[PDB]
Coordinates of N, CA and C (backbone and C1' of nucleotides) and ligand atoms in Angstrom, one line a residue:
Chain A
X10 N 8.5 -15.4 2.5 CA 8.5 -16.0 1.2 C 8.0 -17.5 1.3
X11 N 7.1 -18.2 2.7 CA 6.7 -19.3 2.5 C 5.8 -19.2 2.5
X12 N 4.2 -19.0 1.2 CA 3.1 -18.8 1.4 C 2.1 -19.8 1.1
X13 N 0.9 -19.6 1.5 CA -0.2 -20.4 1.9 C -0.9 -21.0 0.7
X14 N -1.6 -22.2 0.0 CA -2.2 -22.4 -0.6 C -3.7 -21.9 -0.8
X15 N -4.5 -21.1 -1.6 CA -5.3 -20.1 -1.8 C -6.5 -21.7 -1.1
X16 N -6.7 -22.9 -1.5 CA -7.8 -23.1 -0.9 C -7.7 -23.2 0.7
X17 N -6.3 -23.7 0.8 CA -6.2 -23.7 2.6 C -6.7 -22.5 3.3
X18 N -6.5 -21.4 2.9 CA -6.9 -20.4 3.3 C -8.3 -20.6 3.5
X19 N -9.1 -19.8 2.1 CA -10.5 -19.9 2.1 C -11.4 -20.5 2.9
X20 N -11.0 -22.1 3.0 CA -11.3 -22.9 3.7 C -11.1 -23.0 5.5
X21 N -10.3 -21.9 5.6 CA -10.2 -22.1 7.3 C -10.2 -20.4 8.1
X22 N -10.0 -19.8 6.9 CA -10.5 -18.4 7.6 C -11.7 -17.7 6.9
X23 N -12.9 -18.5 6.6 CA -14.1 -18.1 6.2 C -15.0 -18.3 7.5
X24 N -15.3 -16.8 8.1 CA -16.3 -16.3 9.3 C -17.3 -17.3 9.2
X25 N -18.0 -18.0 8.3 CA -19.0 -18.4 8.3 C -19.2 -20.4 8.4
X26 N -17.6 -20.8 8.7 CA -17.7 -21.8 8.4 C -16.9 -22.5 9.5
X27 N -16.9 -23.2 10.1 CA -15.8 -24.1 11.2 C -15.2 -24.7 10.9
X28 N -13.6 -24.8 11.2 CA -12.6 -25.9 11.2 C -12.0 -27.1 11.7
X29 N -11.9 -28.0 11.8 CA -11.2 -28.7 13.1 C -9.3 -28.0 13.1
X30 N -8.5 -27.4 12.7 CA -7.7 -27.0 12.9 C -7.5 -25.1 12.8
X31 N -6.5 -24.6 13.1 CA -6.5 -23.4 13.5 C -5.1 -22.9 13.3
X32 N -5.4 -21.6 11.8 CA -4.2 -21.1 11.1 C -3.7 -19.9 11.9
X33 N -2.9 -19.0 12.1 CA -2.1 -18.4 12.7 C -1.3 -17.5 11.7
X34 N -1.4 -16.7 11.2 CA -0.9 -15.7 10.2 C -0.1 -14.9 11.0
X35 N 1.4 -14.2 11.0 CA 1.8 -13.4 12.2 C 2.6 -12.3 10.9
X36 N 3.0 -11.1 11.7 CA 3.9 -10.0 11.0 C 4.2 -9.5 12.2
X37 N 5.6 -9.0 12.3 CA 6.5 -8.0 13.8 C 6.9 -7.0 12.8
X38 N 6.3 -5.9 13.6 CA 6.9 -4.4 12.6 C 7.5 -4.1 13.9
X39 N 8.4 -3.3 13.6 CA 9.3 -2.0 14.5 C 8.8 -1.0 14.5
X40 N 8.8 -0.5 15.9 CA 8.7 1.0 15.6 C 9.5 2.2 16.1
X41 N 10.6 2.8 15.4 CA 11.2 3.9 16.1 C 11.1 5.2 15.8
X42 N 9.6 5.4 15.9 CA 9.0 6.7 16.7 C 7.8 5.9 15.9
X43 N 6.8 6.4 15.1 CA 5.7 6.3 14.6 C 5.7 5.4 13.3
X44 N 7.0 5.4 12.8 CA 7.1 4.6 11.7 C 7.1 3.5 11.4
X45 N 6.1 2.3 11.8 CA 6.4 0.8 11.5 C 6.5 0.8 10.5
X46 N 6.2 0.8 9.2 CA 6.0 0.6 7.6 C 6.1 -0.7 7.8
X47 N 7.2 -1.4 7.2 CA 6.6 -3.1 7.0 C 7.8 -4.0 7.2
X48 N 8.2 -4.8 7.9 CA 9.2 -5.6 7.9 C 9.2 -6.6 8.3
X51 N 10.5 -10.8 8.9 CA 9.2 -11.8 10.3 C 7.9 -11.3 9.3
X52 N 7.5 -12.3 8.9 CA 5.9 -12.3 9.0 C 5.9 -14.1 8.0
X53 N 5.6 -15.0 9.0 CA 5.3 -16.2 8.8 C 4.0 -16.4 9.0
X54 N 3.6 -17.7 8.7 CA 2.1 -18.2 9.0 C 2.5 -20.1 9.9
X55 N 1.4 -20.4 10.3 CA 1.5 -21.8 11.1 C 0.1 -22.5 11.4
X56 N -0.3 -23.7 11.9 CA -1.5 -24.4 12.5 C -1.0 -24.8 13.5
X57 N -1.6 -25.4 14.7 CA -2.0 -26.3 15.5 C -1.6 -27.6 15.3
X58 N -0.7 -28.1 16.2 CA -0.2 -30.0 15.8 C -1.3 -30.3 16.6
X59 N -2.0 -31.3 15.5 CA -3.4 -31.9 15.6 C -3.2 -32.8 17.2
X60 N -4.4 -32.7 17.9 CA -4.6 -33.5 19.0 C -4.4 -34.8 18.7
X61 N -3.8 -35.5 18.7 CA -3.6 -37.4 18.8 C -3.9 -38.5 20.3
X62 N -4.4 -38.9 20.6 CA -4.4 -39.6 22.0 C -3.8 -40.9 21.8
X67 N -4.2 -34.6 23.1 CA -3.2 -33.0 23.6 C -3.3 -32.4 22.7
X68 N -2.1 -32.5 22.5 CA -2.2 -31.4 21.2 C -1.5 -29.7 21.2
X69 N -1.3 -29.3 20.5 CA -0.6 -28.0 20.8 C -1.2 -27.0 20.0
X70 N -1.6 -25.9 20.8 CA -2.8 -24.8 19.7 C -1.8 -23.9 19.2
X71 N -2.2 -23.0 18.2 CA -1.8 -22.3 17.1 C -0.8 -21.4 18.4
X72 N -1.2 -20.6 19.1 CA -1.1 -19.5 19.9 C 0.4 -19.9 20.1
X73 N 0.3 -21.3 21.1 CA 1.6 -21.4 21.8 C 2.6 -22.1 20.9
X74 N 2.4 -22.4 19.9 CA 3.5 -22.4 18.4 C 4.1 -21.4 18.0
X75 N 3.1 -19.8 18.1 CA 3.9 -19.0 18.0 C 5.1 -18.1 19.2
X76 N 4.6 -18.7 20.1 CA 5.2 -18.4 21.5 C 6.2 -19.6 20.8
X77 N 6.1 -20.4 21.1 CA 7.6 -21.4 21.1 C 8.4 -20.4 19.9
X78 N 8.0 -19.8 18.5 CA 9.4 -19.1 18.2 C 9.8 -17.8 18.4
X79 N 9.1 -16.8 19.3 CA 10.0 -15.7 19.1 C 11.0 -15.7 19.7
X80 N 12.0 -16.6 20.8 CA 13.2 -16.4 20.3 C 14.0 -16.4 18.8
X81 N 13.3 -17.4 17.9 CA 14.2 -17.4 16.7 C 13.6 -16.1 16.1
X82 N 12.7 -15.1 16.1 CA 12.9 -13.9 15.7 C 14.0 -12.6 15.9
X83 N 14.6 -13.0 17.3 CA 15.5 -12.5 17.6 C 15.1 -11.0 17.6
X84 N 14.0 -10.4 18.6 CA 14.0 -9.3 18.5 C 14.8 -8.3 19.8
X85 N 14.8 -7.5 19.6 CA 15.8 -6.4 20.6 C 15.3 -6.0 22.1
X86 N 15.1 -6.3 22.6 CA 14.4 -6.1 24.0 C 14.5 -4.5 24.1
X87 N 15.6 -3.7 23.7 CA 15.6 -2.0 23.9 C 14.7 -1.5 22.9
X88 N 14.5 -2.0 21.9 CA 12.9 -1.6 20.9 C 11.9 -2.1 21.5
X89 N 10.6 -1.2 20.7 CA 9.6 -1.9 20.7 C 8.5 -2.1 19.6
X90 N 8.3 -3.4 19.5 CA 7.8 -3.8 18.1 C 5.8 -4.1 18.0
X91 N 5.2 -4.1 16.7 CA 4.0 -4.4 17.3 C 4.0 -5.9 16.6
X92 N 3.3 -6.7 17.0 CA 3.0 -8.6 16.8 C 1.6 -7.9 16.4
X93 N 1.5 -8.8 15.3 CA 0.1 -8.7 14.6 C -0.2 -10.6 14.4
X94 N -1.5 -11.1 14.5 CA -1.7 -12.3 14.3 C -3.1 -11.6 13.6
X95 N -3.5 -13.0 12.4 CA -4.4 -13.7 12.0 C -4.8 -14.2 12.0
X96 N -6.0 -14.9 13.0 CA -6.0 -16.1 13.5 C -7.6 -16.6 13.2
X97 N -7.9 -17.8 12.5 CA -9.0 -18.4 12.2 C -10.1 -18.8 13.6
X98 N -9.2 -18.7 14.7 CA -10.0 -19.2 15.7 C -9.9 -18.0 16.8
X99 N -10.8 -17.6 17.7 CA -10.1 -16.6 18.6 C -9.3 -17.7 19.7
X100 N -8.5 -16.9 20.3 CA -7.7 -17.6 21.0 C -8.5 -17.9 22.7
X101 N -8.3 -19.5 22.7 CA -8.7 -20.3 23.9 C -8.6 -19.5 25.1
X102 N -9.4 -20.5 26.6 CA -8.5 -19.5 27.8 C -8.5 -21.3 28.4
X103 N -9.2 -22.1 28.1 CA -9.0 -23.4 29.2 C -8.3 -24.2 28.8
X104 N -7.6 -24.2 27.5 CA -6.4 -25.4 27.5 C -5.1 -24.1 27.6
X105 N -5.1 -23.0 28.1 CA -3.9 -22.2 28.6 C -3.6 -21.0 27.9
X106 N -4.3 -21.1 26.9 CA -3.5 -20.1 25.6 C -3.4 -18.5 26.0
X107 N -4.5 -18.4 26.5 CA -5.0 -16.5 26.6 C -3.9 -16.2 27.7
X108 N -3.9 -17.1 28.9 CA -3.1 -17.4 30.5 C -1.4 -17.2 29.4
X109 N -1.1 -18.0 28.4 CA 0.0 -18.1 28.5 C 0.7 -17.0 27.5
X110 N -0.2 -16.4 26.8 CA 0.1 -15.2 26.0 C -0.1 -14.0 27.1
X111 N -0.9 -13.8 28.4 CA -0.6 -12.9 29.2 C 0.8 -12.3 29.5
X112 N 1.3 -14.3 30.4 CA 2.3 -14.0 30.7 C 3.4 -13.8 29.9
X113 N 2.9 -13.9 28.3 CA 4.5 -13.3 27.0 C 4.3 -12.0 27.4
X114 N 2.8 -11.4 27.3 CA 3.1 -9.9 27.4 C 3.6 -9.3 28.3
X115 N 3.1 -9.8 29.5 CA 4.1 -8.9 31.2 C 5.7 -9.4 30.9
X116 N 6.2 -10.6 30.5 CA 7.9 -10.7 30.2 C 8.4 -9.9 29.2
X117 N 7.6 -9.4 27.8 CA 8.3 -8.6 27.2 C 7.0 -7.8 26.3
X118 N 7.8 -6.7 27.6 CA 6.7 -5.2 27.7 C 7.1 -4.4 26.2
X119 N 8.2 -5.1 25.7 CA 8.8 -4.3 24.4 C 7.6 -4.7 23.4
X120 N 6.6 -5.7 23.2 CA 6.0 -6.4 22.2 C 4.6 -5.3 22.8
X121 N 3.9 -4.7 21.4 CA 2.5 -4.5 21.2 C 1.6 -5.5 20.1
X122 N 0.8 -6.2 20.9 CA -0.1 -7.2 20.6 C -0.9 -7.2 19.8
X123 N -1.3 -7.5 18.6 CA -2.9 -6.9 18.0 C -3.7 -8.4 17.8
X124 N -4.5 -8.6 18.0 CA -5.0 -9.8 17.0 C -6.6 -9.9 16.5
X125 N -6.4 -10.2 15.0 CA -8.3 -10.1 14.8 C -8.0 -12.1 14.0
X126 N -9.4 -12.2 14.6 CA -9.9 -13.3 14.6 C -10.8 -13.3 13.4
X127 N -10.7 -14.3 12.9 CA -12.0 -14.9 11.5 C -12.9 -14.9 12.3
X128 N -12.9 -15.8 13.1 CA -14.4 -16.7 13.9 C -14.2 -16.8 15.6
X129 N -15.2 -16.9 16.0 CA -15.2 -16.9 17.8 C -15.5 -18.2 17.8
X130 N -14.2 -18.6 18.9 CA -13.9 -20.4 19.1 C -15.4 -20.5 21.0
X131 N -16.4 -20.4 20.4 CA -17.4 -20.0 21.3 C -17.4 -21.8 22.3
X132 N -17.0 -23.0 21.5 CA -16.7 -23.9 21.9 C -16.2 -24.5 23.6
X133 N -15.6 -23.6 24.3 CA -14.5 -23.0 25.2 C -15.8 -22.1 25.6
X134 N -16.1 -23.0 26.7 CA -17.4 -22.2 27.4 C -16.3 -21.3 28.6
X135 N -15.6 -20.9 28.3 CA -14.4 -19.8 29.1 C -14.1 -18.8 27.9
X136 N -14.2 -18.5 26.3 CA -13.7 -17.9 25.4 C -13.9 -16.7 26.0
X137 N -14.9 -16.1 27.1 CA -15.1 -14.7 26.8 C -14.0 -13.9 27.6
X138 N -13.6 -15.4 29.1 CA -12.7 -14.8 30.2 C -11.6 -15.0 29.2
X139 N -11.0 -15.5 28.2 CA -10.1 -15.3 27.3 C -10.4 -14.1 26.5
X140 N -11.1 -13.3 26.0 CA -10.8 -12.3 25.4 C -10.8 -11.1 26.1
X141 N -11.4 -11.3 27.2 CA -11.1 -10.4 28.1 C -9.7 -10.1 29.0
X142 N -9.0 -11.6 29.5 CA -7.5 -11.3 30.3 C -7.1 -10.8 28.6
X143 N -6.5 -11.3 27.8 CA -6.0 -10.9 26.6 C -6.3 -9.4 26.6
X144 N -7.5 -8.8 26.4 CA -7.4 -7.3 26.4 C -7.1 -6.3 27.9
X145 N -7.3 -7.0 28.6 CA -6.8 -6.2 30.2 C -5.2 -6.7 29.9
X146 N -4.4 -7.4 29.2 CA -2.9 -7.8 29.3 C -2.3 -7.1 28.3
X147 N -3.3 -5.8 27.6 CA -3.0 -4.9 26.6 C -3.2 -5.2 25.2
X148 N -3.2 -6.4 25.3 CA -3.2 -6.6 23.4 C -4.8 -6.4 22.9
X149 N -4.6 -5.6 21.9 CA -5.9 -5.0 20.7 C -6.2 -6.9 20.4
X150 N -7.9 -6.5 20.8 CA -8.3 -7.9 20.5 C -9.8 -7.7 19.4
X151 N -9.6 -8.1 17.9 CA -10.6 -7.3 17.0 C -10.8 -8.8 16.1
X152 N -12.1 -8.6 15.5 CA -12.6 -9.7 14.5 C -11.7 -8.5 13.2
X153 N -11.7 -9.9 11.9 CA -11.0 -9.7 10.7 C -12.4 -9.3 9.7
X154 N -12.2 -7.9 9.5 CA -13.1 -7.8 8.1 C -12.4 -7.6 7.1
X155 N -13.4 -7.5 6.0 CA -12.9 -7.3 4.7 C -11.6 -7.0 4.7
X156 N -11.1 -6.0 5.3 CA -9.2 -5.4 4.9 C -8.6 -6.1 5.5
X157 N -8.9 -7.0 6.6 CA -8.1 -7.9 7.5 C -7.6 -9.1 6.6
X158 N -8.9 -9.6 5.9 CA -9.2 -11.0 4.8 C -7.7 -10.7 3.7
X159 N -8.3 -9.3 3.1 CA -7.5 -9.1 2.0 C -5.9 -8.9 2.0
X160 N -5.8 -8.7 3.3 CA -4.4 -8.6 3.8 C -3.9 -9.4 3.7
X161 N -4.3 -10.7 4.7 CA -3.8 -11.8 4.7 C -3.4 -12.5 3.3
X162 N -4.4 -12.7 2.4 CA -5.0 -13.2 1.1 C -3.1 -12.3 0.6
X163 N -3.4 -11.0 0.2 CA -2.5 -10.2 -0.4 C -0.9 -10.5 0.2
X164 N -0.8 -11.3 1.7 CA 0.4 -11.0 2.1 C 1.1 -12.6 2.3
X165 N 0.2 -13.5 2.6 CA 0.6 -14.7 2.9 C 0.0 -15.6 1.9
X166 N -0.8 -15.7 1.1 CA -1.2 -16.5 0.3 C -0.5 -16.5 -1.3
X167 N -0.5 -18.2 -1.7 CA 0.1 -18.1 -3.1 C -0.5 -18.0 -4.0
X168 N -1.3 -16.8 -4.2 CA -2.7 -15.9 -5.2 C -2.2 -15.7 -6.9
X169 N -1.3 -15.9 -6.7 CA -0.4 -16.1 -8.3 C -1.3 -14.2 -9.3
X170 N -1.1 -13.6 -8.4 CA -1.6 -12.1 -9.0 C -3.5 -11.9 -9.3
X171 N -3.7 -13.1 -8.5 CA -5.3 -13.2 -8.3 C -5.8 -11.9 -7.6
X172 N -6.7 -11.0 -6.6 CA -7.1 -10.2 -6.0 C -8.2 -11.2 -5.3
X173 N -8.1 -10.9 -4.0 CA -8.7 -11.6 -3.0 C -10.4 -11.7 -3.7
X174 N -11.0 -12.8 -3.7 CA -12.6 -12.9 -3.8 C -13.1 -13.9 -2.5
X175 N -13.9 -12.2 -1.9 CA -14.9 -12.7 -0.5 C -15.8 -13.9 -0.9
X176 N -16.5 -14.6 0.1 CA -17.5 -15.2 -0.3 C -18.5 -14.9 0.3
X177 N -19.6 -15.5 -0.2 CA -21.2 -14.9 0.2 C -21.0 -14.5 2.0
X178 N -21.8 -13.8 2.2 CA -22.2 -13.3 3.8 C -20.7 -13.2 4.9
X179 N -19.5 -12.7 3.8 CA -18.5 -11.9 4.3 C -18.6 -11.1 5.5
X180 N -18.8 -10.1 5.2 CA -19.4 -8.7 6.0 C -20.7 -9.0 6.9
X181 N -21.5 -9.5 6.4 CA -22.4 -10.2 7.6 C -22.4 -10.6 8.7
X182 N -21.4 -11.6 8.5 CA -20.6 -12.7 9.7 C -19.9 -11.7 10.4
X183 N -19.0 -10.9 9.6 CA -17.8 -9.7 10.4 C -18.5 -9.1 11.4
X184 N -19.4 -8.7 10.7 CA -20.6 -7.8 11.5 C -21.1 -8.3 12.8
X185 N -21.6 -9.1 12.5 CA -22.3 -10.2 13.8 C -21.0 -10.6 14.6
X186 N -20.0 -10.9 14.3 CA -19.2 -11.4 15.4 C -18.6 -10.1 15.8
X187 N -18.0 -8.9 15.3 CA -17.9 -7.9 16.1 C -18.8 -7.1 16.9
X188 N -20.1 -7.7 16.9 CA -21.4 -7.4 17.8 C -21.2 -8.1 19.1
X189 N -20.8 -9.8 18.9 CA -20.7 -10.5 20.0 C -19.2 -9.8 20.7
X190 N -18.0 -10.1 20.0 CA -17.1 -9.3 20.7 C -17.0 -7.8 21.6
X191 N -17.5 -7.0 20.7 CA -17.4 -5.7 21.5 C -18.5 -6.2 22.8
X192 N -19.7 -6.8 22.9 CA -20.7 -6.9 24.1 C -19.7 -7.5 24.9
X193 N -19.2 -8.5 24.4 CA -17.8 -9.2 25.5 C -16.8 -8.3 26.1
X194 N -16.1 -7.3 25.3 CA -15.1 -6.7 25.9 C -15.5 -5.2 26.7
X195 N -17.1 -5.2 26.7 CA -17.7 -4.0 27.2 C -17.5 -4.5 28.8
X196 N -17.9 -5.6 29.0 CA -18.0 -6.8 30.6 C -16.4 -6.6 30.9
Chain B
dG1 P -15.2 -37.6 0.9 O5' -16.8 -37.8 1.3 C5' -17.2 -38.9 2.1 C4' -17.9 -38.4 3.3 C3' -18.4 -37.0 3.2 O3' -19.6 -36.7 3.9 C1' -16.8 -37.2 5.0
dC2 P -20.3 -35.3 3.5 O5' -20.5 -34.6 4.9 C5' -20.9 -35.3 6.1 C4' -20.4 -34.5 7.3 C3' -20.4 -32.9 7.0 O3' -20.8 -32.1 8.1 C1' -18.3 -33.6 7.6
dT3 P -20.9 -30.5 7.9 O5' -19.4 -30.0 8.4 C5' -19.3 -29.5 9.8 C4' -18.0 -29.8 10.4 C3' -17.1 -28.5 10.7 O3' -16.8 -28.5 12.0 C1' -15.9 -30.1 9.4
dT4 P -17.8 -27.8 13.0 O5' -17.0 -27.9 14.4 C5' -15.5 -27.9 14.3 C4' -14.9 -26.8 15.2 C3' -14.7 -27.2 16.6 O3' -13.3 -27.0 16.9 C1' -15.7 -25.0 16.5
dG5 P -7.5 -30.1 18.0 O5' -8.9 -30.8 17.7 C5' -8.9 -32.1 17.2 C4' -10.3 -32.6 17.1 C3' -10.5 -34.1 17.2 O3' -11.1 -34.4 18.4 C1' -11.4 -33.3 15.1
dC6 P -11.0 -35.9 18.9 O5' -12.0 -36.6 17.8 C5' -13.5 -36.2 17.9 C4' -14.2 -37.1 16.9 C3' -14.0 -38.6 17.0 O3' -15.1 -39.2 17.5 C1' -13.7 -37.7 14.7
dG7 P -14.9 -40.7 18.0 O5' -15.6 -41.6 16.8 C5' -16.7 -41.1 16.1 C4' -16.7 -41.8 14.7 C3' -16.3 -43.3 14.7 O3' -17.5 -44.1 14.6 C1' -15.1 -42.0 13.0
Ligands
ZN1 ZN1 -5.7 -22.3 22.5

DNA sequence: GCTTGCG
């Protein structure tokens, strides 16, 4: 029930456009047998670099203790994330080691944009997928989700912007060649 | 303001 303002959105998970900061959408479903249906699902950014800084990733690592989830279940973590996740200031390294400590968590995350910046991004999306977690760009149903689930749309219906699907396109071209290596 | 924080 704390949702996003529709331009903050637009403005930082649009495939086609770059941000200096980096939003983080998350949802934890359960699952006990096949049934996740829908049940935790917050959003966050990055505390801005000032001279460090702290990226979106390990913000959401600092709370899942206060999720309080059951270590005898197992749940899937879904992220939204405007940036793909780093590997040289630690992030991909330090979300590995969340996965091997708790084997109970299935990973998923689709990305708006490839943080290509991080001349290491590709060995980050590669340990991240050898550490199990589904590593996918956000198309259209990804956008609208988020839009539908975390934003304050006041009964609006998500509107794409020009070269949506284009961009989706092209960057799940660069990712799958990445995760083929 | 222009935006893969900086000046
Ligand atoms: Zn990072």
């Amino acid at each position: 029930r704390h949702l996003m303002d529709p331009h903050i959105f637009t403005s930082n998970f649009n495939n086609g456009i770059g941000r200096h900061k980096t939003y983080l959408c998350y949802e934890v479903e359960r699952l006990d047998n096949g049934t996740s249906v829908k049940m935790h699902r917050g959003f966050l950014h990055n505390q801005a670099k000032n001279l460090y800084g702290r990226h979106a990733e390990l913000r959401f690592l600092d709370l899942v203790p206060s999720l309080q989830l059951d270590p005898a279940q197992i749940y899937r973590v879904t992220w939204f994330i405007s940036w793909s996740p780093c590997f040289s200031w630690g992030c991909a390294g330090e979300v590995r080691a969340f996965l091997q400590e708790n084997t109970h968590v299935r990973l998923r995350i689709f990305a708006a944009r490839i943080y290509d910046y991080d001349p290491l991004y590709k060995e980050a999306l590669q340990m991240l997928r050898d550490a199990g977690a589904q590593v996918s760009i956000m198309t259209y149903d990804e956008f609208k989700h988020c839009w539908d689930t975390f934003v304050d749309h006041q009964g609006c219906p998500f509107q794409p912007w020009d070269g949506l699907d284009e961009h989706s396109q092209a960057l799940s071209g660069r990712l799958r060649a990445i995760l083929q290596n």
